[PDB]
Amino acid sequence: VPTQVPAHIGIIMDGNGRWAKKRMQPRVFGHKAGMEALQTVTKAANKLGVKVITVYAFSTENWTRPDQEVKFIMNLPVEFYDNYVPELHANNVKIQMIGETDRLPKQTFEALTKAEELTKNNTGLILNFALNYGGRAEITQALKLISQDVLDAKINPGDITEELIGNYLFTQHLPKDLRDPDLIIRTSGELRLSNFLPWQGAYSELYFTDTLWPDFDEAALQEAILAYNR
Amino acid sequence: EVPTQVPAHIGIIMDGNGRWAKKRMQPRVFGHKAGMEALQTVTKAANKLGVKVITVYAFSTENWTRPDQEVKFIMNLPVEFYDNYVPELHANNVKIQMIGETDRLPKQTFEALTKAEELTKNNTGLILNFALNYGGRAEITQALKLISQDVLDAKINPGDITEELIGNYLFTQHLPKDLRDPDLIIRTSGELRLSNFLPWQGAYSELYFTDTLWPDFDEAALQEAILAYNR
Ligand SMILES: CC(C)=CCC/C(C)=C/CC/C(C)=C/COP(=O)(O)OP(=O)(O)O
Ligand SMILES: CC(C)=CCC/C(C)=C/CC/C(C)=C/COP(=O)(O)OP(=O)(O)O
Helix, strand or coil: CCCCCCCCCEEEEHHHHHHHHHCCCCCHHHHHHHHHHHHHHHHHHHHHHHEEEEEEEEHHHHHCCHHHHHHHHHHHHHHHHHHHHHEEEEECEEEEEEEECCCCCCCHHHHHHHHHHHCCCCCCCEEEEEEEEEHHHHHHHHHHHHHHHHHHCCCCCCHHHHHHHHHHHHHHCCHHHCCCCCCCECCCCEEEEECCCCCCCCCCCEECCCCCCCHHHHHHHHHHHCCCCE | CCCCCCCCCEEEECCCHHHHHCCCCCCCHHHHHHHHHHHHHHHHHHHHCCCCCCEEEEEEEHHHCCCCCHHHHHHHHHHHHHHHHHHHHHHCCCCEEEECCCCCCHHHHHHHHHHHHHHHCCCCCEEEEEEEECHHHHHHHHHHHHHHHHHHHCCHHHCCCCCCHHHHHHHHHHHHHHCCCCCCCEEECCCCCCCCCCCCCCCEEEEEEEECCCCHCCHHHHHHHHHCCCC
């Protein structure tokens, strides 16, 4: 007290399966508890004044998992709209999603878009869902849009700068001093980066903890925000 | 007794040269020569263990802000490395290559690096990859800029733009494709930041952070990192 507080926190949610397996619970059950954890962390971050949280929800590598697990994860955003979005909306939380939408189920996409439309005037923490998201994939579509704007002569290749590429990423919709996470948290002891915000996180502080994501709570968020330092 | 999985490509963020020198009542710059000394040891030790590539982050484009003197001292480093160290890497079958923006390097530095390359270009052992005047976002921007230029020239259709394609335009394009991406990225001196190092290529790397300062990082410390690698 007082610590510097990260304005934008990225979160890689690991341990849902381990958390469920450790408790003699089905694997998928763990992913709902991870969503339960997110409500706690999202509320707690809002209390401390964090401006943005980007949580990695469903990476593009994830579709390989057995259909059932995919079907179960994809239903998660449906209950979140019915059962969780009201409390975040009551807490002034803005919900946004980045990632590839075209390949989502309809019930999932509608629940996400409704959650957005519900909260679009809210002025607190922005909960930014990364769904069907991959960093390399994100940069490639941005490089494609730029190629197409270069052929259309809206921009000359000379106009392509770091500032410019930033305006074409899926995080373009965040305000500019908040587009890049100040901190990226990964739980469950994994020290890999897994294609999460490779551009935007290029200078981020990293925080790795053995705590499993469903066990990550206000206290664990606070252990991470203190440890932020520079 | 059992074998450890060993990373084929190791990225190394060399931190702590200044801390190392201040801790030893030595001038700040002296630590950076010791940082280069550490690199010979680490480079030699990795070659013994069978690592195919090391990309060491030498001079990031943000580093030019430092006092001219420190820059002047670092930039002379590749001259002594050619005279005093490249022969031993060459005797050890080490290939020397550099990635980053060369156009804005001093001439004695660029010439020492390019000769170092030409001397060792046929060597078939570990590839010591110097990242000099390098920044990941800048690397990707030049990669995305050239592609826009090849699309206007109609060499590639916008439809040909894939992840595999962007990979061929990065500074790591000259490496073999199964080796372009580091399997492990080491950062010394306790820093848990990424500092713009291979943002594309390292997207899936295992990370290893150690409090050891770079000039004290040796074969033993390299082995602590290759062991800790796991999958
Ligand atoms: C969009 C939305 C409402 C999200 C709410 C929370 C949610 C759906 C989290 C699931 C994220 C995910 C795929 C975790 C995989 O962990 P894992 O199975 O790799 O964990 P393990 O390493 O223990 O197996
Ligand atoms: C052949 C060749 C190029 C050899 C160079 C070897 C060498 C001196 C590498 C160190 C590069 C560097 C700028 C270190 C500064 O670390 P710091 O202690 O200032 O770290 P910080 O970013 O954590 O402050």
